[PDB]
Amino acid sequence: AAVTQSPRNKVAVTGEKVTLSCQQTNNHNNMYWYRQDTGHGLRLIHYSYGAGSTEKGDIPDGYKASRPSQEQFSLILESATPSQTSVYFCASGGGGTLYFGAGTRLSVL
Template sequence: EAAVTQSPRNKVTVTGGNVTLSCRQTNSHNYMYWYRQDTGHGLRLIHYSYGAGNLQIGDVPDGYKATRTTQEDFFLLLELASPSQTSLYFCASSGTGGRYAEQFFGPGTRLTVL
């Protein structure tokens, strides 16, 4: 059974629209991450969290909010979507201890902003 799930898998919205992307992990991991993937840039970190109620700023945070409501659930919010946010979004989780940097990814959400 998939340990990191994302919804929706595809989303189309208009400029200025409100979008929420959801991620759930059942790995019992403390850390969760949101990335965006664009051609020529690989994966870039938007926000991450080490537990419920915590939020850390990533490398490309502008235009994005995030909230971690439980250990399992991490949400990415786009409150005024722009065409520059058209991208493939991935959620990931990682644990602590010896394999702390090992990341496990969800299937991705393809977002198109018209």
């Protein structure tokens, strides 16, 4: 419903830069980037507390990030590599509640 991901599919090329966009409607301070793996659930990569802020999550090597607007939060693969392929989500959230979007299938060869 409330936190759109661009692109929605996307295969990329051993050694490119991929940039996934996460846009949201409710003007929440907080935003996060999780990669689902299998028998892994969502592990967190980077999060952020407003325009200008980004923090390490649990798996954070590889990926840079950046929150230029309120509404918009980008994850970035410094140099795409096979092992970064996954299904990637973000969320916004005021306090107790979270709000995800529907996944980005990234496949890298």
